[PDB]
Amino acid sequence: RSASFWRAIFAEFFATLFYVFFGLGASLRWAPGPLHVLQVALAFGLALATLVQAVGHISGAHVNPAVTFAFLVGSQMSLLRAICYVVAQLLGAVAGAAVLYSVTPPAVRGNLALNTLHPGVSVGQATIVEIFLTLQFVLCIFATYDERRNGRLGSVALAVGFSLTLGHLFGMYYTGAGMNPARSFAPAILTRNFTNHWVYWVGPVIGAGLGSLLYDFLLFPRLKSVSERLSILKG
Amino acid sequence: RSASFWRAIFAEFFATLFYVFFGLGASLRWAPGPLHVLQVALAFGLALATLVQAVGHISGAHVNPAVTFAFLVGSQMSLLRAICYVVAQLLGAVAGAAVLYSVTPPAVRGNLALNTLHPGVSVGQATIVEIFLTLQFVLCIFATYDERRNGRLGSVALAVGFSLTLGHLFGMYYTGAGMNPARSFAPAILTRNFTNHWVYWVGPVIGAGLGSLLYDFLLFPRLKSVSERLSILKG
Amino acid sequence: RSASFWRAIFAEFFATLFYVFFGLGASLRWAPGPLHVLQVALAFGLALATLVQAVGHISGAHVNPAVTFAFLVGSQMSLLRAICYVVAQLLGAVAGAAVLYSVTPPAVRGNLALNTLHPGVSVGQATIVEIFLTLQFVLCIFATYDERRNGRLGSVALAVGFSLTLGHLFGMYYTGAGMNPARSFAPAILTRNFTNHWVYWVGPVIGAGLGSLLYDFLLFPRLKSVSERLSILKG
Amino acid sequence: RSASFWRAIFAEFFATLFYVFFGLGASLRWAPGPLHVLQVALAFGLALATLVQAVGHISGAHVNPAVTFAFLVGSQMSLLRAICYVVAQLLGAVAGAAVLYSVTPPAVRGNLALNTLHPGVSVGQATIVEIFLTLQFVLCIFATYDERRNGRLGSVALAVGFSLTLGHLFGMYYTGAGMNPARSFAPAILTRNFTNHWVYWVGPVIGAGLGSLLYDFLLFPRLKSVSERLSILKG
Amino acid sequence: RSASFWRAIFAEFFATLFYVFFGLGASLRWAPGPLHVLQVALAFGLALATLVQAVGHISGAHVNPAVTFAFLVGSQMSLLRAICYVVAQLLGAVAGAAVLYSVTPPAVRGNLALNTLHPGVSVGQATIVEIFLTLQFVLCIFATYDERRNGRLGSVALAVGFSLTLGHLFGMYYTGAGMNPARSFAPAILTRNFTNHWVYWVGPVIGAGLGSLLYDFLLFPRLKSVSERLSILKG
Amino acid sequence: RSASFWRAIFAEFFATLFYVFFGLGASLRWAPGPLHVLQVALAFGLALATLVQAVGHISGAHVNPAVTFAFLVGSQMSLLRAICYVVAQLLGAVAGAAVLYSVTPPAVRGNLALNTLHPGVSVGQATIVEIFLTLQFVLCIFATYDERRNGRLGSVALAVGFSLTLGHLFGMYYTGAGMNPARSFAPAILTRNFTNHWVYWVGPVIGAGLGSLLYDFLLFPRLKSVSERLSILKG
Amino acid sequence: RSASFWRAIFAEFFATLFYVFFGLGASLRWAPGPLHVLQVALAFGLALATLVQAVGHISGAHVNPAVTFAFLVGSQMSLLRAICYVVAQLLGAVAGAAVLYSVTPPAVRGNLALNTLHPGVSVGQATIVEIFLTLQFVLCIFATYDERRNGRLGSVALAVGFSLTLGHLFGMYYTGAGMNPARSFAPAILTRNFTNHWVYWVGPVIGAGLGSLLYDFLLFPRLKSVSERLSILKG
Amino acid sequence: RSASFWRAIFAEFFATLFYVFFGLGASLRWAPGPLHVLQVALAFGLALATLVQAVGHISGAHVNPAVTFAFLVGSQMSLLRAICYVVAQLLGAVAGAAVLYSVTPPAVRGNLALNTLHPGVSVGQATIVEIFLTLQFVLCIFATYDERRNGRLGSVALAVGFSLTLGHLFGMYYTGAGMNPARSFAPAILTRNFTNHWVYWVGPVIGAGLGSLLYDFLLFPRLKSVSERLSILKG
């Protein structure tokens, strides 16, 4: 019942809002020497790990327009819920990004940690990089959220927050490691700096997409009906 | 004779060209932890110290549209030589900035070390900061280039390259420490990023100006004729 | 029957049209000393109080894209009627704003009383302010339009026009007190001055929204079915 | 000697700087009811009256690119001094306008009291109005600064600050009463709002001009040589 | 059957195409003295009169996004057919306008007879004028296309082409007499001159609309069910 | 003496001002049938014929930046006087164009009779046309203003106003017949419609130029020294 | 089943991707003398011939938003499949165009073989040309894909790849021979050069459209029901 | 005498005009296979060779703002004559480019043979390339125009037209081989395509400059006074 749909939508609004707030608010590279990298990288992972322990208990804790797209291709969600989530994540983001702005001194709140391709990196490589970052990440979630799979994986939250962290350990250097359009979106709107911005929807969309592909049919397929299950779209 | 005017103009073209090249090419903050600050800061000082040991022996080694302006108000140069120098420094800069570009890998040659005001800093403070940076700097040159003054100052080049370095030790954080329009100019032209750029002419112009003022009349005045000397403009 | 839907839509077109016309046409701050504030503030309240005595008898007299949104989240209207109303209010506004323009001398019809954030106020505070203005206002309407509640409230029209007036007594200083997108919209279109304009949809949308929330579930909830009632959307 | 030229230029820089600062800083219409009009109007007059008691003792205290133009046509100044003054007034203005900005809270420092034509007023009337404002004003200065004229005029400063004040008592309603390009210039540059801005150079330029005309030849002519005196331009 | 829907759509594409072609191609005011007015005015009427004798026999011969809107409010058409017609008229227009362009020498095919508000006329009057032009015109069609009405009206085509002509006899002076968005559209697209262009959709839309109103309910109402007939929208 | 230079400059300001005012104010094609052509064409001629009877008695009555250029190449004027005239004609124009604007109802004062190339005419032909128009015109003035030539030419004013008129009888159709940049300038500035505007400086500049050429050396040369006379530039 | 819909969509993504890649990657006119024409012309034909032998075995191998539109009017597809194909071809294109970019040296990958109208050709002729190119091409596919027709046509792939080739043999000179919006689209997006770009959707859309017309009803009609078959749209 | 200055200026106007006309009008690459290269390359050389046989007999036949700059640094011309030439070459160019336009069918007169950097070439290399092209070219002219040098060089015209041709044989591939700003200028103005245009002033300016350097002092110096000769600037 709606007491579920609208909860999940809010859990997705709050879960994304905090994600941006904490993640982004740690990324304000206030610390040059000790690579912000291990810092912001685990920040984003723990942030996600907590939100999944917390929210993944109600909505799924996608907090990522890429993952929500990845479950949609995945013939797991409804295009409705799948669009409610993206608007709730985008609103979450921007909101968590507004708050961070209101709480952090100017001198720190620069560009709000806006994802920006690395200097010599160009957009195609950038886009390549964001593809692999979302793919490994979307592949990790599909595999931890996948019931049939079980035994001893421990914690989905870590099993998934470390995926996000590995994403950044690598991709903060190539693209700042957005791998979440919401997250690239939010500070693109508040700073009005939409430069090389599309790299961040395409890259993770295609990544997410050809990640739910590389799992659902390629790696760990489905043992009943594929055409029958696609009826979830119609409801 | 012109064999002097045109030398000085070239010495100013080369002396500025290298200045940008070395200075800027060190500033490419390839090193986060060990503050680029002590690095790029002494880079700019040594760069200047060498150019002054080298070129200050022929033209004066201003390599700075602010200093050339400071000597002009200073009723020391001709508005001609004073304009030849600025166009030779701007051309020097851009040229030394073109070369650096051609020699440094993309991944390193980001924005070419473009002077950009610090995040929470606004333009007026920025402008304030650039004023004090050029003032202390233009004051140090006036006082080391000032013959009547003597005894034991040691080396003008250091006596002046440390001034530039103190400028950066402070002002790389507020404004990136341009304190040389040429230097802010050159990468503004190659990257086509003229944002908050005027802060860098005003700030150092006014600094230079009210620096040749704070010395020539205020601190260490002139003991003959002030109105008579101003005849240098007419030649 | 449509003889109701289309009436309400017109009542909403006229009711909004007059609202803008009277409200806005009083706000033309022709009177500096005696704060336009008590003036335009009661103007907007009486205007609303009359339109509600008048029109609230047929459509609801929302004359405010924020209130119409607030009843929609409120699971009280149909997304259809809810969109018919907003287009009828926007058309009402602009029309009532066109007329005012045609009747008032230039020297008076300046910017048509365009909502503009106060000088030192920034957009986030502005947005904050518009949130609280629509919240208290949308909360007052929900509570006066709420049947179960009764006894001795007197007049909904006043019980609601004073809410609008309190909105302005406060918010004309922070944001000009739009708290009605229609009202900010109309003179934004005729003067082509859409500056800081979004502050006026967001601010009151979120206000209206988290106002129908703070009442419907928080303060004075519903005693039957929440998931069942949401079937009104489907008709 | 330059000890005079450069003094006057500074006296004109400071005298204009304060003028903008005080004038403009009073005009921040912090007081609606009691017409800012008598307030800002005498502010600008006293400001001028003081600057003339003060500076008119050294440079002339034009603090107005219109008056400096008016003395130039007036075949009283050199095109050099006449251009030094305008750049010193424009720099004065902007500087006095920067300071005001740094000292006054946002909530007060709105548009910095930017001259803006009145609503129904159009640009030609506006331009007409600024013409008459500078004409009466430039006529009053010519007549108080005019030696041959004497007897009992009392104080030039008042004899001239009341002229400025009468200018505003009238023209703050039509154009905000710039009648000083410097003064319209300065907040046009800091707020980057050059709307209907030219109205403020033309209007007062033509006013000043056909004001030094209406006096020098029309009303109170010259009794020696007109063609001979014009040799002042050549020095 | 579609053999009707798609015919009408083509009849509307051709019928509009010729309308623009002939109408517009006569309006190329190649004749100053003999007012183009009687000329282009009857051109547009005959053009319409012929297209209605011709096409009004199959689709209705609206050849006017305003009339098609007028029948839609009129609860006579389907929103589908009503949108098919407008896209077929817009395509008709542009096509008939392309052809005219390809057949008429440059020296003649100026702006393609683009509707442009008259000089001193402003947009609101313009919009007023286009309202009355479409109203009288949409009122004439409703009344000639209205079966219950009969007896001796003679020819609908004239009974309707004279309406168009009276529209122009009047409105070519105020607005060029578009009274057909298609017709204002087509040369707005080929000449890329969309100036005061909206005046031509609004004006005739509102005219058409409050014209099908002034007839359907006001003047010559309906004697069965109004709410029941509105079921045509659903098919 | 200046009592001559400054007179001529004013005579050129007024003489141009009226020219635009009368000429342009007749050209407001209030009369379609009776070609505005004979009308505006003689208007411009008489206007010129009067201004030359009137002003050509003091300054030369060029009232045309093209003719003033034509006398300059003509080694007849000083580059100073030649620039004073153009700024006085441009100011004259705009002023005479402002006045016309203030005196003529909107409905008449459309685009202020802005010169605009004819529809099928392109810019090169246009430019060609304006060349021949200024050439025949500049040739007629050179030949009527040329003393050595005499006998029985009657009236220079007609001998020159008919030249202007023949210019228009022809060129109002190709280019509106500017053949006076001042005249194309003035309504280009007030209406802010600088379209195909350069056609009007080039075309008449080159015309004027290669017109003072086709006369001074080609047709009716000079019988003393050509290199010696060019000393007029130096004074 | 979807195992068909989604295959076809991919076959259309890959089939278009290669088409652009091979076609476009041959068209990089690396060879001036030997007309690129026979080269790129057969390249595009073989490319298509192979993709049809290959993919036309599963989806139809439209690889052309024009052909997919042509089958849609053709009442052969569903508007859904018809839109899935165009987004899959556009994505195919851009992707095949991205790859080509990543594999071909700069010096070769100029504008990516962007369709651009020929110099003296204008847009209407261009549009005319693209119409005939898509018409003959869409007519050839309709006739080879048309079962009832049979006997001895040999190979559809050639029977269709030669059609594409004849298209280019002709139209590379007039328009570069896009005749495939996907193909004009892809390098318009990567080079950001959308000049005269619409010529390439219109031209081939209208061509395709009035090509499925010239066959389905005109030349080789249908012998059962036309209105009944149109039920495919509803599924 | 001027009978020389003004001749040379015209000879430079015509000599440049034809140069553009013939050169450019041959370059209209109407012939793909037989490299336009040998064609346009000798076209530009012969064009120059003829203009030098023809005009180099009066003005020098620079027909190149780069060469005129090269003689200026060369302390051979006056900054006056040196600026007269550039404006006469730019006017020559554009004029010869206008004519070509008026004589050549559209289908041929594409972009007017606009210099455009080669695809993979970037601007710095481009600029590098244009430097070497003007250097070898400016070096060849200095050495053929250099009297002291003699004996048996044959024809300066060839001795110089082959230099231009070698310039193109090489540089039409890298930059289209402008090596004449006039020549890049002229079609940049008529086609309004100023893309990568500065590459063509810088590149050849610096080339010309450091070419008159590499000869005058480096390779074949001067045996009298260098400071004394520079007095030519003062006349």
Ligand SMILES: CCCCCCCCCCCCCC(=O)OC[C@H](COP(=O)([O-])OCC[N+](C)(C)C)OC(=O)CCCCCCCCCCCCC
């Ligand atoms: C299905 C996908 C599976 C994923 C697996 C594929 C991953 C590999 C993709 C790598 C991206 C290639 C782009 C690149 O690293 O270099 C492109 C090229 C660089 O020059 P060059 O190496 O060709 O030769 C010059 C050699 N020399 C420097 C020694 C002289 O040109 C330039 O402008 C510089 C780069 C500008 C961006 C171009 C992006 C191309 C789009 C990627 C293709 C993906 C298709 C969707």
Ligand SMILES: CCCCCCCCCCCCCC(=O)OC[C@H](COP(=O)([O-])OCC[N+](C)(C)C)OC(=O)CCCCCCCCCCCCC
């Ligand atoms: C769920 C919501 C419940 C509603 C209850 C919350 C109401 C409170 C919200 C207040 C808005 C905060 C914005 C503000 O008043 O000041 C932001 C900050 C000012 O500097 P500072 O105070 O941080 O420190 C400098 C201190 N010193 C001046 C002494 C040196 O930066 C600036 O640029 C100036 C302001 C520019 C606009 C920034 C808006 C932030 C977005 C609001 C957050 C709402 C999330 C949707």
Ligand SMILES: CCCCCCCCCCCCCC(=O)OC[C@H](COP(=O)([O-])OCC[N+](C)(C)C)OC(=O)CCCCCCCCCCCCC
């Ligand atoms: C239902 C369709 C069936 C297809 C069969 C029709 C195929 C024929 C269409 C031909 C296109 C006509 C455009 C054209 O070749 O020349 C247009 C015109 C050229 O001047 P002129 O020949 O009229 O007279 C000047 C004569 N003199 C040069 C000797 C002085 O004007 C200009 O600006 C130059 C051309 C600029 C583009 C204009 C395109 C017009 C739109 C085409 C119509 C299609 C309707 C959808």
